[PDB]
Symmetry: D2
């Protein structure tokens, strides 16, 4: 449960369902290594991306595939994706919720970081 | 469960705890009648404001006491409160989540409306 | 001069044009007295609401008529209006910009207060 | 002319001044090639990044160095940077403003695309 992604739709007033999410981790050579991926559920949430063993310290990028989401709804949006880049677990394990609120030409994102 | 309020703190990356919330409903004479009130919990959520019987159609105002929240934290913020005003239940009962993301000089708010 | 309102549309990626904006000042009896109003321009801005002489310290409310905006574009929105309620304070910077970014079920607002 | 970046601070209610901004263009091999860069002005704006001739259709990334901004103000932030990735499209309006509103653990971004 150390990483969860929650996505909301500001046009519909609903969870953003079936949003693809790709997580990357910066490697020692400075490239972005694929780390985990998944899709938001009916409630706009994506659980089960990783484990506390696997989710070591590092710089992580959470790519939320907003264009793919809006295009699947037959809408032409502005952004390719929403990217959230952050250092994680560098003071020990934390739990991270990455939330995003989507519109066709805009988005908001926040983090909720909790210490278990 | 027809009305829930969720409040997040964009400075801390945490739920906004102990935020006072006052709900009003517009009366037939156009005044704002007190309807319900409460405080956010440790998880930034406020449940139990009303019931499906009580939460009839109307125009509702959810006042989130952001100044009181920031002042209790010893911070001087810009806004007096965040107000969310909406018509509810006019196509039959719905469930409403009013979410707000707070900063000292800014806030975001959204609604998630679901049909039970 | 001391107060400007700027409104943007997050669905179309544009200024929000021809949006009605009403400003009120809180009176001694806690009622909201009309203070100034207008409609946003082609750039989504509303200038000339007040003057330094008139814009004394106190609590003000800026009401942005978002519902009518969305309905005029053929879209059904959630809110009746967006409300921004704040205290004008002489000790802080002199010029207030109240900005709002609109979606059908959401809005963001910020204040940019400068000298 | 065709691209402007505007950055605001939601903690202080001000423009975000002296923020480094880097623009990249996606190359044919999917790498990000440096395109333009600068630091925001006293009004939080960065003008003069490119010209109409240079700003051809394609995918661009605007990276805003938010971490350094917050640290220079003595504040610990969440993100490494804020990223805005979009396609420039000739069929749409000609001028792009990329706006960002910053908090330590959050940001909002919008596009205002006009003629
Ligand atoms: C106004 C606004 C609201 C939200 C909502 C965030 C969250 C929301 C809405 C949320 C809702 C339900 C739940 O079980 C857990 C949740 O966790 C959240 O972080 C997120 C952003 C970025 C925003 O600008
Ligand atoms: C509530 C909120 C406000 C803004 C403000 C954007 C702009 C603002 C505030 C702006 C202000 C003055 C000006 O001369 C030009 C401007 O252009 C803008 O795009 C931008 C975001 C992302 C947001 O969430």
């Amino acid at each position: 449960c150390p990483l969860m992604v929650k996505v909301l739709d500001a046009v519909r007033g609903s969870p953003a369902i079936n949003v693809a999410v790709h997580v990357f981790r910066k490697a020692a050579d400075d490239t972005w290594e694929p780390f985990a991926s998944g899709k938001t559920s009916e409630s706009g949430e994506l659980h089960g991306l990783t484990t506390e063993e696997e989710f070591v310290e590092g710089i992580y990028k959470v790519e939320i595939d907003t264009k793919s989401y809006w295009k699947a709804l037959g809408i032409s949006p502005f952004h390719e994706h929403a990217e959230v880049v952050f250092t994680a677990n560098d003071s020990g394990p934390r739990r991270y919720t990455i939330a995003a609120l989507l519109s066709p030409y805009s988005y908001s994102t926040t983090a909720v970081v909790t210490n278990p």
